[PDB]
Design a binder for these strands. Structure first.
Length: 179
RNA sequence: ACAAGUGCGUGGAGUCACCGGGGUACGACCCGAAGCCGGGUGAUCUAGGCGUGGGCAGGUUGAAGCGUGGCGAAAGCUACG
């Protein structure tokens, strides 16, 4: 690190050619890639930043893969543009947030996005802006989702989904409603 | 029960007493436990429930809430009271 700094600074000050070192430490192999012979491996960053996939817990659900991470992040970015305040949600398929909603009590918003896309949908990445509740949990029942992101969850809700479903990659992100 | 043998019985001595021994049942030569069961007694102690009262020197710590002030484009972060 020390030396890297000594490089970046000097290359930007003394001379002009600037050098950007990257922040990709602690690795983890995933399933594979777009195809079975396309092995991808997530490399977390040591940076303490804030809302990021690095700091998310897979309560239950088979190991997330390439596409998973990708879309999940796109979703996160979508919900994070609206900056707290008004309740909001989102969804996404093949790197395409195809279902943003705001509204009041999530319920409506959530389903309104499901109306937005009632085709492809099945197997998207719901990205709510706060905790999920049974109201719409029963709406989600049958409507296959790949991953469900959320700042936090409610015990009964969490349990409910957990046992009922057998695929939802529940990946609520501890404290994402900040900078 | 057919027979043959055999068992028991048969040519009159028992019965009623008094004084004794002994067996058996009853407390049974005397004393010696824990226990079992019937009907009554007890919550002045102690355990718990309830009603209605009494009490806890003097200090310490300093949650939420509230006021003012900082740092911030906001998001938000933060000091003291």
């Amino acid at each position: 690190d020390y030396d890297a700094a000594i490089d970046t600074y000097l290359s930007r000050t003394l001379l002009g050619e600037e050098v950007l070192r990257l922040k990709f430490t602690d690795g983890v192999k995933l399933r594979y890639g777009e195809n079975w012979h396309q092995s991808a491996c997530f490399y977390k960053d040591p940076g303490i930043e804030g809302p990021s996939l690095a700091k998310a817990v897979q309560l239950h659900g088979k190991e997330l893969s390439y596409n998973n991470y990708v879309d999940a992040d796109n979703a996160l970015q979508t919900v994070k543009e609206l900056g707290n305040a008004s309740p909001a949600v989102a969804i996404v398929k093949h790197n395409n947030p195809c279902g943003l909603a705001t509204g009041d009590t999530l319920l409506q918003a959530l389903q309104a996005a499901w109306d937005g896309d009632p085709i492809s949908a099945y197997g998207s990445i719901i990205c709510t802006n706060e905790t999920f509740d049974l109201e719409a949990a029963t709406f989600l029942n049958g409507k296959f989702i790949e991953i469900i992101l959320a700042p936090d969850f409610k015990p009964d809700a969490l349990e409910y989904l957990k046992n009922k479903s057998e695929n939802l990659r529940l990946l609520k992100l501890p404290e994402l409603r900040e900078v």
